[PDB]
Symmetry: D2
């Protein structure tokens, strides 16, 4: 007995008495992710080096085309695209998909772990599809998750029912359910943040970090980790517990991370896992988007760690 992503999705679609439109969608995503994974591990690079005689772009095209061919979407929002992609009426479905085809594109040259981030909305309204359909608060997410191309490829899927992790067996090109109904640690022992912006941190953030290195109660300090790729940092948080942070500073007073295809999908995954995702002031998933490429500060991870910072945030209020 072994559970594959294809089996899992189908059984979940069956229990939910769906028309099978969303299952077609999730199966198309699974395929896109396997295609991207293969391109990322450099299969066929020899030909590029003349054996017989861009990566973010290839990833964008793969997701966009595999998604359109699902006949289950009406609007697509990509980080690589200025405007939202409205699906041809021939292949038009009822879902809105926001995604980041290849996050951590800067890390590509250094071979650091990268990934794909996606969020699925059910179109709410009854008129010609437009960018306005993507502009829904993260709380309205039908499904969300990510694919991490690290030492191994893994797809983390989060739905109303919970969070489940699927490992890619590259030998047979099938995702195996290796961890079901994942719940995050209450309190971790690692903080993640680009301390190279110390000079720009607000007093609350500055205080929290200081508390981590120099525990006032003289407990053991927190270990530091900052890969540089959100999917890698956040996935480690989900699995090992702790706190990831990318608050505002000179690098945009609105933070760097995007709301629709980065913050929301990860916040959704986090909350479903039993953790928190805040901007320091409000819950990320309750923000009403104003633009499809709207940025937003984010602090996420173990509940007890995120709450501790939230208090320090209140102190300086």
């Amino acid at each position: 007995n072994i559970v594959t992503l294809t089996r899992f999705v189908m059984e979940q679609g069956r229990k939910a008495r769906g028309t099978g439109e969303m299952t077609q969608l999730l199966n198309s995503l699974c395929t896109a992710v396997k295609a991207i994974s293969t391109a990322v591990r450099k299969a066929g690079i020899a030909h590029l080096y003349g054996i017989a005689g861009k990566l973010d772009v290839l990833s964008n095209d793969l997701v966009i085309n595999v998604l359109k061919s699902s006949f289950a979407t009406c609007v697509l929002v990509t980080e690589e695209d200025k405007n939202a992609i409205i699906v041809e009426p021939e292949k038009r479905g009822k879902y809105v998909v926001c995604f980041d085809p290849l996050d951590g594109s800067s890390n590509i040259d250094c071979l650091v772990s990268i990934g794909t981030i996606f969020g699925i909305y059910r179109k709410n309204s009854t008129d010609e599809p437009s960018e306005k359909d993507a502009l829904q608060p993260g709380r309205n997410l039908v499904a969300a998750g990510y694919a991490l191309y690290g030492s191994a490829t893994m797809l983390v899927l989060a739905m109303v029912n919970g969070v489940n992790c699927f490992m890619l067996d590259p030998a047979i090109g099938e995702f195996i359910l290796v961890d079901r109904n994942v719940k995050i640690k209450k309190k971790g022992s690692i903080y993640s943040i680009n301390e190279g912006y110390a000079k720009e941190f607000d007093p609350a953030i500055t205080e929290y970090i200081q508390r981590k290195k120099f525990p006032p109660d003289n407990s053991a300090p927190y270990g530091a980790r900052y890969v540089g790729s959100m999917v890698a940092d956040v996935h480690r948080t989900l699995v090992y517990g702790g706190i990831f942070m990318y608050p505002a500073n000179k690098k945009s007073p609105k933070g760097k991370l995007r709301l629709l295809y980065e913050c929301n999908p990860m916040a959704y995954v986090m909350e479903k896992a039993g953790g928190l995702a805040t901007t320091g002031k409000e819950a990320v998933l309750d923000i009403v988007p104003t633009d499809i490429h709207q940025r937003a500060p984010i602090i996420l991870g173990s509940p007890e760690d995120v709450t501790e910072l939230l208090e320090i945030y209140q102190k300086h209020a």
Copy 2:
């Protein structure tokens, strides 16, 4: 045209006029690296999950076995083995290999980049091979390098004539020379260190760090990055420039990283690349080891960055 590791290695062996003994060794190493990469990528995991019909220990076995069969080694030092392995008189060769089969094994469950580290010495004290033969300063390295199992697999090889990077094309199981004679930037813009040990840093490290976040002349501060995997962090340093640091602290008064199979190979690669690798007080490669599992502090990266920290070390003494 297309250059494969196999062709490159043989070609170099010929120019060098070797008896082809080292070529056999480097060829065996290459084979061990492709076997580990495959295991790491989780190929065939569906079989563990009951489709019907460890990773560090497996990596250890692969490297040991594949090396012994090369008939080119006499002494082997693994991080996984308390004692140095002495090869059978039947399979003995003139080379001593010091390696770390799978480095960053804590990051495995989190799916973060990991790797293999190797250092090759030539047994000169023609006596019965013993542990003593591995106890040579890194200055005596014949060849050294590493394999990074990140988003893609790469093998960095360093020898007297330079450093060369080989990307693995998993389709055909061939390493392609993607970068020739690699040389690191004089000055970088990223510092790498576990700041969670701030409470235990010596005044030199403490001053340098704060100088990176708050630059005297108001210039751009350095970005921070700390994957938690030496091979990953050092490769980023090599490719993008900057400085990696794992100084001595209370928990590790002599540092955490090992001299023979971690510090030395990376120090050797750094020097051949045109960078510096120091203990803070002296060059890593000149240290004459006393224990095969001897630890050593390490600071490496761009020359200009490493020098700056070395001056601060001189200032506080």
Copy 3:
């Protein structure tokens, strides 16, 4: 735009307003076939040769376990199994699957193309499942097809709607629809038969062959081809046209090929393609099985070629 087997099956299940039970079944088969394909191409053979320190049996276990885990079957008939496999009431579905996990097992050692043959029946009755449920004439087939592990892996699926061919892209482990609604040639130019049994052929067969080598109308003779693996021979017939034959002789007066999991699936595929499948006397698909391992003579291929022999058969009646 590209069609995958997973997409195809789902859309076909949707048009047919199924409960999704048979789709779960076809998806489980797709997975089993990819697993077998990988084992056949020898991935991981190095470990068997001690790098770090039966095939028909593995194939049987894979299909049996992957099928049971579909929760869509009640009875399974395998060539490798003396008795039919009755599914545990926990995983019991409504379908009966007859199959040959690895046909041409004798050819394995010679590396000749081999394959998998399957036929799907819908249980007809309302009582405890038993072998009796498998004993239905081939005309009652819901679906049938085969997987050919040759120069490339291909799955041919035949249903009431038609015959469609899917090519396995081993890089992403996905079956691509490369040929839809396949129809066989009216008249081919190749005959396939083990002429090493000439001494045992009945006069009709003997006459046909003679007509092929020495055309009475002085037309061009037929080329000969006999791979030795039914799936390979039959697939070539389906694609290039011609006639495949395995009539009775001293090698059992009932022929060698099995009715349920070899003759029927291939006859079904053939008829759906626009060809014929006969025992010389009757249509293969109309035979009422008496035993699950019942053998049956078979002549299949292009209509005009099969009819020509049928006449010669009548002449000698």
Copy 4:
């Protein structure tokens, strides 16, 4: 222990005391074979089918390019090229390679086993390399063998010291020595020939064939097998014993198969394996060619079987 082609080849080069020039050649060949196997298995075909973002010509380019870069060849003869290719003075070596990049190209669309055939001569007439250098009897072969892309990929290598079979482990892209010093059965029980040419067979062939179906002393008749792919049929002959025949006929008065890149390599492999390879009148390897694309009749296989046919040839003369 585990023996890889790479290790085996180098080891043999060392014992032979070669300048490592031929080793480079055999290493390049090996690389070309893994590239062809991958293309043949249809890896990445999903990209032709619009997932968004020949085979014989491609195989030709791969072999030519990978061989030229080995800096070990001066003259190349391909079935795909009318004229012999003369390597640039810059990349020239002392070896002449005669090859058939992808044999059985008619069987491609039918997915039947196909392969690569190669013969290696040493240029002895030290003059400007020309077509003349390839015109040497197969008796002058330094090395010969083939790659079979069947159910699994295998590389058969034959040299003065014997014939060795290497199985490809596609996971790690390594050829493993699965069979050492291969030697064919004295007598087989399978005859291989296209009997569709019965109307044009000489009385010797005709008598031998009928003697196989109707044995004088009532013994068991021979089984028939004719894949239609030389490499596949010859490999079956090598592994299981028997006789392969492609005699001269009206359509091919001098046979169909080429001397330099088909007959010779297989004849060489046969002789080293302990079998016989005849034209019916003389040994294939002793023929001094006049044309690079010269055809030649061929009969090969177990010694006892080939001898029997040779006696019948003597009887009718």
